[PDB]
Amino acid sequence: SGIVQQQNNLLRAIEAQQHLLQLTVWGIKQLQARIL
Amino acid sequence: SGIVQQQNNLLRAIEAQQHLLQLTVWGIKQLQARIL
Amino acid sequence: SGIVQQQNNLLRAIEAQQHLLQLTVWGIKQLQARIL
Amino acid sequence: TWEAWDRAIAEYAXRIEXLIXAAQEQQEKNEXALXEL
Amino acid sequence: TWEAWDRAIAEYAXRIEXLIXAAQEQQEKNEXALXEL
Amino acid sequence: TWEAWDRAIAEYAXRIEXLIXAAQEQQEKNEXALXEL
Description:
The complex is a heterohexamer, with three copies of chain A and three copies of chain D.
Chain A: H1 2-34
Chain D: H1 2-13, H2 14-17, H3 21-28, H4 32-36
């Protein structure tokens, strides 16, 4: 039960990187637009 | 068979973040160079 | 023993993306500040 | 170009957010298999 | 704003670095369960 | 510097793309162990 609850915790962390990756990209796009 | 096929799906997703992380970095480097 | 040693290798890779995600962000913040 | 990149990112961030579909929907077979055991 | 974003990133990068707490501290139950077996 | 950062990223993105070596090459032991079972 713990391992499955954990693969879930990996899955969970990756999803959180996905939102953080999209946030970095937003920043980049704001710099692209401002600086060009 | 499903769990192994899945750890593989985690592994897979991470590899896809790795390519997306390198893409964000490219953007950053283009902004570094243009804006300096 | 290998799978556990591996989930660990996934966990490990994610931690390494976390440091790489923070590094991209540093870059972004330097561009935010320089270009504004 | 930058819209070549915006497009090439978005699609890629599609593939990932496809994989994390495949994964999320094992995790919830695994959390079915765990039902039995 | 950009400090809205700096704050919204930092907290989010908190949640992740919380999950990878939860995970890291299974991995080391799993590496306990592996003790027995 | 920025070339300090370019270097410090590239090496780090090396470590990850080392781990994902280690991982990818378990996954394909696991997909060997799964052969038997």
